[PDB]
Amino acid sequence: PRRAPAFPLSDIKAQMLFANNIKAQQASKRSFKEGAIETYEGLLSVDPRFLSFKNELSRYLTDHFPANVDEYGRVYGNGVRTNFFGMRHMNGFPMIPATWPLASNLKKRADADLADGPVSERDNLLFRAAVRLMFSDLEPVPLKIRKGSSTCIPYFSNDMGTKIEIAERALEKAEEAGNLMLQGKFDDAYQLHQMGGAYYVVYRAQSTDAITLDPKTGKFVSKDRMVADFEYAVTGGEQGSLFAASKDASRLKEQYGIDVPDGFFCERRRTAMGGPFALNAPIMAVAQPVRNKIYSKYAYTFHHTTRLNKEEKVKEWSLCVATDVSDHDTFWPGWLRDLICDELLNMGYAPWWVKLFETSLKLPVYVGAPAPEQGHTLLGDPSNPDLEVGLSSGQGATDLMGTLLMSITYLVMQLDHTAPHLNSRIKDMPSACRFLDSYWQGHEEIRQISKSDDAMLGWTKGRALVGGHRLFEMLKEGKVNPSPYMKISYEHGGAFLGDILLYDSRREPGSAIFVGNINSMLNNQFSPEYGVQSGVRDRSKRKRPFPGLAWASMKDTYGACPIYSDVLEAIERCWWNAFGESYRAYREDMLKRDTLELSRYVASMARQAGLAELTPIDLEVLADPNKLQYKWTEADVSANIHEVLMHGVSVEKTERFLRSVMPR
Numbered sequence: 001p002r003r004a005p006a007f008p009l010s011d012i013k014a015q016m017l018f019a020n021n022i023k024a025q026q027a028s029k030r031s032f033k034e035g036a037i038e039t040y041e042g043l044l045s046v047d048p049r050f051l052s053f054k055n056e057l058s059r060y061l062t063d064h065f066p067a068n069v070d071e072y073g074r075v076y077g078n079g080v081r082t083n084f085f086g087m088r089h090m091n092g093f094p095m096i097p098a099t100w101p102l103a104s105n106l107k108k109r110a111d112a113d114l115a116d117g118p119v120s121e122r123d124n125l126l127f128r129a130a131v132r133l134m135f136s137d138l139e140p141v142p143l144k145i146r147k148g149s150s151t152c153i154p155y156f157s158n159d160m161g162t163k164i165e166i167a168e169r170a171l172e173k174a175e176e177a178g179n180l181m182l183q184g185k186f187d188d189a190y191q192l193h194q195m196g197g198a199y200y201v202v203y204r205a206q207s208t209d210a211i212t213l214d215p216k217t218g219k220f221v222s223k224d225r226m227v228a229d230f231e232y233a234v235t236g237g238e239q240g241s242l243f244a245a246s247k248d249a250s251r252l253k254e255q256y257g258i259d260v261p262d263g264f265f266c267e268r269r270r271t272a273m274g275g276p277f278a279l280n281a282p283i284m285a286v287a288q289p290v291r292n293k294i295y296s297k298y299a300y301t302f303h304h305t306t307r308l309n310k311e312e313k314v315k316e317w318s319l320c321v322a323t324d325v326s327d328h329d330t331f332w333p334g335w336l337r338d339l340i341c342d343e344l345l346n347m348g349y350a351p352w353w354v355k356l357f358e359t360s361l362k363l364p365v366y367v368g369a370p371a372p373e374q375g376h377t378l379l380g381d382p383s384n385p386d387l388e389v390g391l392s393s394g395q396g397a398t399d400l401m402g403t404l405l406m407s408i409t410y411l412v413m414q415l416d417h418t419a420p421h422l423n424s425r426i427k428d429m430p431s432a433c434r435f436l437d438s439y440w441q442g443h444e445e446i447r448q449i450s451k452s453d454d455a456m457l458g459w460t461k462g463r464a465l466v467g468g469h470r471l472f473e474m475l476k477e478g479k480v481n482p483s484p485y486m487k488i489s490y491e492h493g494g495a496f497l498g499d500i501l502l503y504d505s506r507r508e509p510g511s512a513i514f515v516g517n518i519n520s521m522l523n524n525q526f527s528p529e530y531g532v533q534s535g536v537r538d539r540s541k542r543k544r545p546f547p548g549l550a551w552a553s554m555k556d557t558y559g560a561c562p563i564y565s566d567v568l569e570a571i572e573r574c575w576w577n578a579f580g581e582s583y584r585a586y587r588e589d590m591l592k593r594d595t596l597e598l599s600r601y602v603a604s605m606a607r608q609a610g611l612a613e614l615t616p617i618d619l620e621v622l623a624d625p626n627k628l629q630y631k632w633t634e635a636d637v638s639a640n641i642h643e644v645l646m647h648g649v650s651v652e653k654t655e656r657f658l659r660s661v662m663p664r
């Protein structure tokens, strides 16, 4: 039903993906890798003391703080929405094998009963309106680049200088590239400006995943994670099979002679894709302005910061529904890509740019190493990009694509099941824009706060409110999908952007509050996704630059949690039992040390000043920059700090670029 061409590394098409240089060549050949992570300097994630500590802490917490989640997924009481067994993983050792990325998700969507286009004309208008509101009067900004980040295909450079070169060169030449593409000459576009090629697949770790303790056997059981084999991936699920990966860690004993205690498993791995930087630059140049716009003019539903920022908005609702989307990225519809490009073209965007955007969403994928002796295979032909993988985690505007979808999806869910009386307001593009604008500003009886697949759907007092309760009930029964676009459910233990929504006896938004998820603190402190990379001098280029700084923000981030104090004591106690040291002490040391090191990187920090003028956000980001691509944005981070992590291209240069893309 279209098989998707596949090419081995040795094929010329794959070879053209990697430049004549060491780094690039190595990335094309990189074989499957595995190994304990350096959790903290001097501490191996799989060290016996640590696993012991993990076994005791997880069992204890789970036993003394069972979840407090009602029939409707609202969490009350202790703020615990599940057991603490999630920490029981041999971090650094993946489940085998990782999945192969699906080349087409059309069958997948169809078999899941999702639509292959806007189903009604209203929907078609709202999606196009979303595009109109989001991409209009945009302001130029410098194109900020993450430090130590990669250029991926074809150079694989990590040099800031070279990145800036590439980017400037890209904004200068994007236009020729796109026109070349509009003429069907992708190979030329790629050969001449490296805009094309493929995404590079890298498997990332979900350091914690669900684990259950079956009362009968007294043995632990890990959530099975389904993966696809090469056959399945190239046939869109037609041929091939789709089985559960093995999380069994026993192998670690024979292979590496590591004592794997009972009830510990290999970690879940998620496919991640690095995009060809020459292609993402032109895109990022528009994407950031768009973020700025929606986070400013549409701050009500899009821009989120503190636990209280969220509280203000929800407290005022009569009903709060915490949604849940199944496998967002892989279901994301290509028809939406095409819809968006079409509308962009209508609004007046340079076709060459739109063409780049489009192409970035149908690009081939190079699979690295999903498992031992597996991979190094290119999926799809770069000469005629036509994959349909959903959303590529490393495309320049991934967050916007997920937010543009989902946001309209949720509104439609609301219109469809609770606010039929609003349809008359959506008659044509103008009325649609007018309506959406109002809605995104929190100015209607129905509201939402979201970021891609995370959302809190709300109802104020009114006509639609009775509908809202019916909807919530549809969700609890969970026998019927409330949407034609994506598989939707309610989150069991609702929370938004990391903070758990804590309901009291009343069980209503007004008397509820937003507390930090303490299980998150546990994940962050004992199951980091990456090691400390003590071998990297430049801390700014590390995945975790200043791990110690999180101690400083801990209270502010998680203090509001009902059993905050108890957990800390439990930790302290268990750490004593396992190390004969005080965890609090350990952290204060790490904290002093990192606070010191930091001043080296901050030009405005006295060479020994304090974390005096640093946001709690500043601290969490410095300890984990991942937070900067999922919880917050350039916006929420102090500019001092921002320069530590990012580096930009001249506004002069983006401004000139943007002026040629933008309609007006």
Ligand SMILES: Nc1ncnc2c1ncn2[C@@H]1O[C@H](COP(=O)(O)OP(=O)(O)OP(=O)(O)O)[C@@H](O)[C@H]1O
Residues within 6 Å of the ligand: 206, 324, 325, 326, 327, 328, 630
């Ligand atoms: N701190 C975090 N830890 C894990 N995932 C996170 C975290 N923060 C944000 N996410 C995200 O939320 C997602 C939703 O998780 P997931 O895809 O596994 O779905 P699920 O609801 O948990 O299970 P399933 O899809 O199999 O039905 C991820 O794909 C990821 O991008």
